[model samples]
Target: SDEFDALRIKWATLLTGGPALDPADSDIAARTDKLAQDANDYWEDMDLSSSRTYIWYALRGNGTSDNVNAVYERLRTMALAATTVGSSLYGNADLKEDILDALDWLYVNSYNSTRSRSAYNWWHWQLGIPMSLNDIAVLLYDDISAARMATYMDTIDYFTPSIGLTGANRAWQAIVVGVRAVIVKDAVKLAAARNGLSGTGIFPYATGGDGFYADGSFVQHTTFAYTGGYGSSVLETTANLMYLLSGSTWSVSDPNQSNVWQWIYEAYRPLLYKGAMMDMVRGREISRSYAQDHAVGHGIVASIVRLAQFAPAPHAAAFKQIAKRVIQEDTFSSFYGDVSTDTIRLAKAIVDDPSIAPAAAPNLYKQYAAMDRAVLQRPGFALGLALYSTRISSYESINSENGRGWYTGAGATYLYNQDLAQYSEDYWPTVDAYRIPGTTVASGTPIASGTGTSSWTGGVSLAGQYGASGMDLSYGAYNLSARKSWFMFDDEIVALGSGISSTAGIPIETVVDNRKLNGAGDNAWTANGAALSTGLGVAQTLTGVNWVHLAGNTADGSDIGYYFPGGATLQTKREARTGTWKQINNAPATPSTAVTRNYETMWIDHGTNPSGASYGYVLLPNKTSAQVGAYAADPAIEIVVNTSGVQSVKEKTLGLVGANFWTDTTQTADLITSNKKASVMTREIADERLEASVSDPTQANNGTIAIELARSAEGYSADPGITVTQLAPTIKFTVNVNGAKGKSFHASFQLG
Candidate 1:
């Protein structure tokens, strides 16, 4: 009883910010009241039944365990309200008894031993239900009879006799068992839970399967790049468990515990822009209307806060910086209400602390090569690219989630700027997926989600400042093939496409922009200093357009510019699209109501059966009309080559060159030449120096790739995995890309 008492107080403090609640903290007070109201709402709608299969009629009384889990959640909330120090229902005997009554009713009718093991969605039956019920038992531990508590523990043990899972599922089951051990004071089960959690497969970096990869990529269900979904779940559960077990006999002492901190710094921090997690890494969770990008980000932030409490002092400070920044930058939703009361207290303290300065989003070029994704974060904007290769699937559609996510991973591009809410709310359901920016799509119906046939789907970054991403695009469904590349510079993104051929007897398009109109749907597009028509359901194909500017919906929102070097024909559309979450996913939690949002889409059309067609454009985010026009008149970006053999670009002002060699033939792009399929980026410093970064994105090269530069070098400075074969007349090296796994290698030289 004493052990159980200590754990119960710990859990209560985790939920209520106990040690005593402050009446002066308005947010905490309001959150407690909200919990009381939520419990009451559940009580009002709940129907205790003797004949029905489930407790909640609205949740459907089917054999599925979702309804049973819902009952446990409500009971858990009610217990929190009744036991919270400052809550209106604090120490309310009647409310506490009602919670117990509901829990007993659920177990008897839905989750008792008489019921067979669940066949539909085994997760709820094994992990979800027992986890929630254990929390409820802890909350009402003092009120429950000893006999009833034993029955509850027995039910949990029967359902989850062993932890026989992997990834997030394994972490969840172990956590459920550990919490049950704490509640029931069982040392054996506690040890088992600790050992299972700290086992071999859970924390170690995944070589090829469903776990965190070396390149900051998290995969689940074997193939999907799901850092923000199941990956986040593992972090939350394990971090909280570590906190609970610290200084105890059941403490987690895994040697690989440092991997969690590595994941937080490497895999998670870069993907988050401001307070929103980029949707590219979130996988099917993007289909959930209520679980938008910011919502998921808040969940991650809350976990970071809890983990920081027990982390090493330096690591804890860094974690707190992340938490504080996420909280401060989140303007779309209230973080205080989205997280638990305990998180509220911790995050509030971080926010109000003057000594803890919030960290700003970084400026870097990162490639999640293991997962076929890349991100470019610049001063005023950020860009994310979603691509799939032989290893990564284009999208996931499991359990009827993300049904319309066919093109999400087929070279889709996301642009984030002052319009922070561009991808939030109804944007996912309403936007036209077929014309997703940076994708070369043929005119055809959507196909099933699958992996690309090609292996070249990653990128190379130079000095962590500039980079380039390339993909050998082959959409087998539409009989389309293309070579795409995006060169990231300091202030501009140059996108190029070549070998765009489609035998599907329809036009192929490479969408340049597909931006959501924020408030008013009348955000206009200006072409060549003339404003195009601005209204809903408007479409136009303008000819000889050199530069175009799209207006922002709000005064403070940033505008976007598209610069077409040497001028080109483009198609544009401003339309209000209507859709429901059900159209994309049919999960029971998904709402079916229709929503509408306006979008401005622009694309370059390659006519029917286009053979070796190509296009080029520069995206100047947050640039004005005059700035874009000035850039187009004297374009600093030179499309060195766009062909089936190679595609390359040069940023003259930045002294940078990016090239993607698609074939093993001798290909030249200005100062760089390679005889092997490779991706390379180079820069020339003004102080008689040269820097180079190279990678074999195909990951199939087992031999050296011979690269020759147009300039001479005196001696080497830093070279890793690079063998210098020649120097003086023209610098030359052989990059041994064997087993490189699409990772970048660097070399620096003193220009001679």
Candidate 2:
């Protein structure tokens, strides 16, 4: 035990905040020994070789910080070599010149590659290459020879030109700048460095609209909610910069950092549910299935903790609660990397300070005006309705790889049911295109990937509460069009597709889900109350099936479901299949690899040459097959009319009636919208107070729309004080939508 004490102590120090574990904490030695092995591998890099390219090897290792401890791979690797060379960490003899040589090699040869735009850019210089170079310089201040150390200090100029810029990119660059500030002994640059990282003085489009809005919205890369991608990157780098510069003047917060701090609460806090972030904030470049556990460990997690650390007492407690969910509830594993130390230490700080009361978790529903997505969360589920216009994208294309999912954020809905961990892995890499949840599309054409549809498309939502809300989508892409609306609830979601048409020769379909098959064929598979054959790996077309229960064996039993409201043949498939690299996955490791991934799907296929095709399905998660049959029989959810002219629904139980008027004038069950085509949904908070969501999916330059809600004279007489139209029980109003291109409008009216 003593012989390998260095390894054991190394882990205990980094992980437990000290070089020993307490007896009360179980599994201390087990975790300790396990991490020690990884650290041992990291320290092995201290034995440098000319041919190995130490940077490449260290990049993959777990890191393998302080004297006997370092957590991040790059920081730890460089620190180990420097500290050993400088005679600091136990001043181990026989380790001198080689360590210095290692640093020398990295300074010149670091980041030698083609100018891959995203690859050869700023992140590599800061987070990837120069970041490590900065760490070594700071760790061996007095230990290394002046001449050799000066060579490293001279390397700082490589990033100096960006010391005082604003933007997410410059926010990252500030870390390098501040680190160099400490070496150059320049207080002025130090102030600018810290200010630049947070965009304190560089706000209001510092780097093309990368800051907070008056309404608390934030935009980056010219779109809404960069909190998940570039925003998180900015936060992580600035946080690490502060920590590295701790006890120095640069680490201290000043009056200028207010908005950056506010951005954390407004932009960051609302997007997380049960410790996972919503996709609207994650941006178009990342697949919707990407997980945050890794981001939690080295990125957002520490920022959240720092949020609590720097926040005032009342707010600090609430921030701590947000941190708690990430540590305990998130399904993805927390990494042991660069931010691990801050994550652990801040976790300890929150627990010990009972004076800081924990805040309530985030509310269930949130809508971003700029991103055009609505998110609803329950105890264990997350429903995201995505809306992208010609202005944005279904997925961003850069570095030559465009992703499959032209409709992902364009009138697409994703359900993260039962623990909210669906599709956390690289799950999109092999997805069958047609099986996307709550999507309406042409079924026959094979799936393909691209940046987006060539035309403008988006959705709108009015309800912003957790238990229930409504969404209206008008998605036009690849010669396909859909006037769709979804009523989202905790247990089930209702999908209505009307006005769906495409001139394409192939058939069109509305799919509830094409989720993976349950394990070993042991899971349930039923249709129209009858048990269908499992593991068949082929399509089974059953007509007039009111419901289908195709369950996947996911962590949550909710990987199963029911689609209802009766009428139509349901094509159920438990067939083995392949997902295209462009469709289900990312760029192949085995380039051009043709791997056929498997999945089971169910949808109502409108065969070749069908017009005005409409589909209605109720998604019931975590329901038994018998339960599904009963829901299908009653459906209680009524679909009024789902033509291109009008899409409307009334949920009898909720007493909720809503409609999207796709035509200039349409009477759908006694309600009408005037002069403007739209995708709208409404909810009645009370008989007298009605809330509505409207969007101009037709790309309105400037237009006005009117809505009339019909009611009996007696109903209006009951609420005599309410505003009314002369038409008996009717309540009517017109909204100046300003311009439909904005893709969002909210209005409320009183009963007549």
Candidate 3:
């Protein structure tokens, strides 16, 4: 009914085209006046304090009117009046203290219940209320007594339990309120609040994925999901409060902590046009809310602007991109019908070079003048800009506060140009360019060389030259003359050594990617696959060498060296292949030629045959009775007989069975004697057999026992008479003759 009346009056005034009648002269006003008077009388009769009426007047009263101050003064007056009335009524000495305590309790406990359903109220979320109340108490500390202020804080603690008692919603609320408490220098309250948050595992958004989503978005849980227009606003405000209190180093173990910035980037940043529109309308698809509150946009801009300056390179890059997109979308223009001049300027400042972002001296003077004039007319509204200006000014001053001059030309300009040149140069350079003072230069001082092609020909070198004087290089250099002198122009010798150090501080495995370079297009050779293959082949060669020489040959000739035959020879006459003598009639001729036997044996000699005179040999009394024996029967003895003669060859064979002997169908040890050129043929056969046995163990063993017996009798084995293990393929037999006419031969024998 009241709304209908207001609308009717407004419509009537519009039709009449004149000022409407004063509320005091209106008919409904008269009725409301009478009702208020009656209520006042009833309240007076009840003898209740006017605290509720005073609070309502303070909140709703227009500050522009004289009644606004009257309302405020009446509030204070009523509060004191209530205390006095209570003291007199109760007749208690501590009645004023008691009333103040009750007021404090009511204020703190008001938020103790569930949060309000109405989104318009300041304490809708319950967390911000206590923080707001605490802020008020601190602000009014000078106006009120310290005892009253203490009572308010004490009540805050009594009703507001630690964050651990609640879930994420209350925990965040406590953090917001707690940070405000800390800012007000309430150490007791701050400690309790900080402890509550920390103990509950509440971390900043990015710390450990606790407070945020995996993608770095802040989680607006159920309590905030339906907060309507105030959702992002409240969150950003709380985050800014915490950030300010933490001196810009805010972190919480809560997973959502890191996501706070990401959430702001998603919601408030104009990176996406849809997101920006949604932000303005409380995320509703239609029926947009046109409320013009610049505080939300201003807060996000301020946070992002600071992050661009102080954040790491990658983070700064992300922020800059978002800021640029925000500007392109003209999100700020939507809030203020037209683009706000201040906002555009601030955006320009952020996008421009960081050094020149804050307005220059000339622009600063103009801004100061404008702001001063604006402040005189509207101090409250001006306060907001003043606060922002103060922060901007302070940030500019402190960021370069270390007294380092801004290198205008070759210093900062070069670095900036480099950064623009490539993304890799965005980080700070690893090289230091300064030199220690008071350093003396000696005659022919050696300077160190630099890795880059560019030389320090004009100015002083930063790290000195690579081969500097007093820098030790003797132990490092393989050759002294190859050592380079500093500042020399010999490209050939100077280029011999590179700037890179041979020793690596970090292991190669850490930097190398282990993934195989497979696929048709992959460069397998350059990508480490070729080197791996080469290493495998070398490993086989090293293993093979160890297995071949088992006994490991020593200088002691007791180790047997195997031999093989070269060619055939006739058994009718004996001949020395060494050209030192010609065998004639069983005697070596002394440089004499009878018929010129033409001993030109073509490709029939190995040239390493032992001299026949070194051993003694005589024809047997009965040649037909002589029998051929196995080569292993007397390996140490040299045979001088030729075996091409039928009378010299005996078809007798002996059976042998052993694991190491070569085998054949006959199952007999192959008789290989010095006669009939069997010495060379037999050794070749034995070597082939040994190789085959090593490769395939299933092959039959032959003459292995006889060889072991010969080696044992000759002390080649440890026991002369005992049967010990024999090395296989022992086929060479050195022959000895009693006369100078004797011939030496070697033969390898195999038996089956």
Task: Tell me the TM-score of each prediction against the true structure.
Answer: 0.97, 0.78, 0.28
* Candidate 1 global lDDT: 0.84
Which of the numbered candidates is closest to the native, going by highest TM-score?
1
lDDT of each: 0.84, 0.53, 0.24
Off by over 4 Å in 3: 1-52, 57-125, 138-144, 165-168, 180-211, 216-238, 247-299, 302-752
Task: Report the lDDT tens digits of candidate 2 across residue range 65-111.
Answer: 11111222344443443332111232332333444565666544553
Per-residue CA lDDT of model 3 for 496-544, tens digit only, reads 1111122312110000000111112121111001111211102111111
Candidate 2: residue 141 lDDT (0-100): 45
Q: Tens digit of lDDT per residue, candidate 1, span 1-752?
A: 47656766786688667856775788888988898898788767766544545556677564667666766777788888887777888888988887777667666766777766665667878888888888888778889999888778888888886776778888898888988988888889888888777653367888787888788888888888888888888888888887887767877788887888888988888888777888998899898887788888889999999989888768899999989988887777888868888888888889989999987677899888888989888766888988998889988988888877888888888888777788888788999978788888875457567787899889898978889999898876778899999898987888999998888987788888888995558886789889888888889998999999997754654789998877899888888899999888886766888899999888998988999999899888888777777877788899999998999999888899999999989989999999988899999977588899999999889998899999888887555789998777898898889988888889998885
> Taking the candidates one at a time, how many backbone clashes does each contain?
0, 17, 56
